[PDB]
Amino acid sequence: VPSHRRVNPPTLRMKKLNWQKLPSNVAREHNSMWASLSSPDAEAVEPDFSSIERLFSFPA
Amino acid sequence: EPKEITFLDAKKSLNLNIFLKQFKCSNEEVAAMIRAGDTTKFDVEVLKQLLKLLPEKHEIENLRAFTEERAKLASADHFYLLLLAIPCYQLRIECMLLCEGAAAVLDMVRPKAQLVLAACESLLTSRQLPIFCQLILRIGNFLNYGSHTGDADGFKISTLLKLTETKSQQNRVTLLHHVLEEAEKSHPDLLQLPRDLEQPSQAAGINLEIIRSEASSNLKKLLETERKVSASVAEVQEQYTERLQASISAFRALDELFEAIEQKQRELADYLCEDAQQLSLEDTFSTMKAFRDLFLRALKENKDRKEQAAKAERRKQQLAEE
Amino acid sequence: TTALVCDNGSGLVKAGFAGDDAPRAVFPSIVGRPRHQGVMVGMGQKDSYVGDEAQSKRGILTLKYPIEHGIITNWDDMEKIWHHTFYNELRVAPEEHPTLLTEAPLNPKANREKMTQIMFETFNVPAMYVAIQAVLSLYASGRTTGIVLDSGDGVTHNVPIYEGYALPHAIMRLDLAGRDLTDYLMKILTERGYSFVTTAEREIVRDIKEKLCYVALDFENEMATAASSSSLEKSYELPDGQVITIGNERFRCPETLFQPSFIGMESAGIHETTYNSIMKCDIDIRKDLYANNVMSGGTTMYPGIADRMQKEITALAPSTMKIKIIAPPERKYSVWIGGSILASLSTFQQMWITKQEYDEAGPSIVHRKCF
Amino acid sequence: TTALVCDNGSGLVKAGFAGDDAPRAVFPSIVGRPRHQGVMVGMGQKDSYVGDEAQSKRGILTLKYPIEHGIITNWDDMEKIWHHTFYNELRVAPEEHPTLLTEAPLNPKANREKMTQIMFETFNVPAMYVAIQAVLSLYASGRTTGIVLDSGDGVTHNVPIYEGYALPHAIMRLDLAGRDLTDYLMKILTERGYSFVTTAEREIVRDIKEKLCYVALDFENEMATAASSSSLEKSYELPDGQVITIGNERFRCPETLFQPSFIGMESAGIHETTYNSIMKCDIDIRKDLYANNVMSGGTTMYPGIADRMQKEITALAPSTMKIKIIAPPERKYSVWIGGSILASLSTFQQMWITKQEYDEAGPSIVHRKCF
């Protein structure tokens, strides 16, 4: 259902990233700022996936 | 006349002579504004030196057993006789020291406690911070696809520190640099993100328990001093009771502000969905001060990157023209 | 018997009688020697001008400072300075007056031996005393504890002291003061086309440093203001009648006190040196020291140094405890005022260094007597 | 293929090949940037200098010592030091040589994870293993189980090891090492009468610590003969001619390791942290902890530290009269030599962390392969 979950699969291998995963039932509360992620009315910025794919891909 | 008949030793008389010579006046005036209740020429350090040069029991007994001419004594002993002529002089000096210290501690703690209250109130209600977390978690859920760390719908505030840990292939562009560079092109309202959070800026910069213990100790000392003045004479009452009541009222308002800080601290702990047993007050303020400094350096380094890119483009157009 | 307080500083010697408020004989410490030849026979052409006569006749004289970086380098010149300040200025016999003297911290011991032996063997005194300049500067302020930063002509040193106990390890010294600012002012004045190379011109550059320079509250904003508008440009009239006009050099010259990288020194500014002096102290007494920062020395006469110094200390230190700058208007003579306070006490009669103590213990009892 | 061993030190980073008796590169842990402003060309001068090149041109460079007390704080300068360590010091590319690495004990987990992800993402090593310096220090002596004292330039630690695997509960930390000993040595030589404000003076005091300082078998007895010892008083010549005389301070600088109350903190000594760390283990391993006690680091080059460790463990523990504390002559680089012994063996090929392990497990593989 949310807009941020709709991620296209990229062709090339991509560099990983480290933070700590926290559960989703905790993060969708009324006092959390990510209920605005859960609501579609927010400003949806589309990242240029082609730019990240040409730049941040793993070299062969 | 070398027989100055001073009951003190050399060192304490030397210190009291250095103390007496700063006032550029006679010790009669000194005992006068000790008695009259003046705060102009007495800050904390001068009263601390005066309490550190108090007369002792044998010194007071030797001064009271003295029966010859008063002019034969030293300036130190005449100052101590003028001090002993004041009834409850140590109580009056303690009222001086505690009212001046209470005023100094109130003017130090109260704007900073208001800054802490404004900090946590703006942290509880922020406008562009949801949209900044929208853009951050969109890029983050794009990046960690197909792994155990992916498909999350939120993070703590400490993840805002971990944005700086990301570095590109060039090891010069962070994730925060790329997010602010995209936000400068697409949604510039996130560039007004420190404007709502400027009252969270500079953090507290202190430890709140230290100033709270100092304020509680000062309020307890003011209550004890008010009880001691209540046992004293009515001149001390009309000299000090209004100022002591104003200090007790201001410290009670400060304790109400501390209780409001505790309530908003519990609200901020539930707001970021963290338990209240861990440090969710000073860690969050140092977190927000650190993250806003990261925001300001990321803004100015993106501006410097665009400026040097424009200068290099002008140099390339120059060498193509020539 | 009236004692004498004689601060023999790097810049200006300040001497007078004890128990007074202002020093009578304030004069710069220079020895002027004529580099040219004499043709006019007679009229007292004396070969080494000392003091204000060297200042007035400075256009034909090579000027030598006997004090360099708070160290008595030239000794015959410094003896001539003492002879002039006793016999010509005060006009008193040294054998009937005690003479209080001052010293820089972290001084060499043989330097103290040499000033003690000149003050007991050539200029015989009944008694004399050597004291730290920062301690007398604190005693002028009337408080027993605090940190004194003193920026003379060669030395800017920080001394924190708690209840009269001067902490030796927390004293340090930075060789950046008024003469280095004067030399940097010579270096930056050639950008506008004004050349000053002679030692006679050092008095002129020192005079415009005294009259026109000021500490900027923020260096970058004052840079933008000076670059934008010519409102801050100020004129000066030279002794030959020429008029110069200076711009940003009114604040670029004291900014070496906060940024020593201008004259090429790796050490940080005086605020960081004060901060590192405070961290060398014990953590309990730092609260007293932060609210009792006392300036002394004429290099703190720039009329923007207090607010900028408060800003730099409050920015660098944690903001838990009170930051207060003690900058009295008479802090230029606070060494002399504190010496006049200390000399005129009944308890000070037994800390005097007598002639008999000198005969018993050489010129070395000042080490075991004074701090 | 031959392996690479580097000890990422707080004061000296060492690098070399596996199987070598000595490290080929020994360079201080410094990153230099140009101190003054100026651009020109000058035949392509480098923006950053590291190591021996940074040591050689250090007058026009501001240096950075980025490791604070064993623990990594600034990470970009470690990345630049590792880039020098591979690409110019050994002149290698790290994507085909397995590389053994060293960590300070009680390292934070985020530091280990960041270290592993910078090895696998930036340098792209095919194999890396993080080892505690004490485990390699035991491997230089050639055993697999025991407690090891390791004092480098950053921090002192006592680590128990079981079959090559350390026990992080009973690792103890003492907050001093050779940098803190160097600071204390400047402090008590300043109390002796000297002064060290420059870079070269600090390097001369470092070489004084390298050459002259020792540990006596008894502190109290050697105090008792300190005024009367004809062989205790040594000295050193600075190349410009300054003479530094050192007396009892030769065994007061390293005895800070044995008693940290010499400098003003109440932390337990190198024998007391060892004894308290032995008692915090299981009871069965403690005889093997006493049997394989190895000291390591450049902070253990003081002659007569072996018999004093013997006497102090004899004093605290009544079961340890005859067991000998092993002190190799090359325990400057026993971290590096034990890394050479560990990496050069054919039993270590399984224990390396592959690229695919980091890709499938994240950085947290450093918690689970390096233990």
Ligand SMILES: Nc1ncnc2c1ncn2[C@@H]1O[C@H](COP(=O)(O)OP(=O)(O)OP(=O)(O)O)[C@@H](O)[C@H]1O
């Ligand atoms: N021969 C010596 N005698 C005494 N001290 C020495 C000697 N050689 C070097 N040192 C000092 O000891 C330290 C070197 O020890 P070592 O190489 O183990 O440290 P490091 O690896 O940089 O530190 P750490 O293990 O904490 O990261 C430095 O402080 C150095 O000045």
Ligand SMILES: Nc1ncnc2c1ncn2[C@@H]1O[C@H](COP(=O)(O)OP(=O)(O)O)[C@@H](O)[C@H]1O
């Ligand atoms: N009004 C002033 N404004 C700015 N600087 C001054 C002023 N008066 C004196 N100075 C500087 O401060 C120094 C004052 O000398 P002083 O501190 O009294 O003794 P010394 O520096 O020789 O120990 C002079 O060298 C002069 O350069």
Ligand SMILES: [Mg+2]
């Ligand atoms: Mg002076």
Ligand SMILES: [Mg+2]
């Ligand atoms: Mg090492």
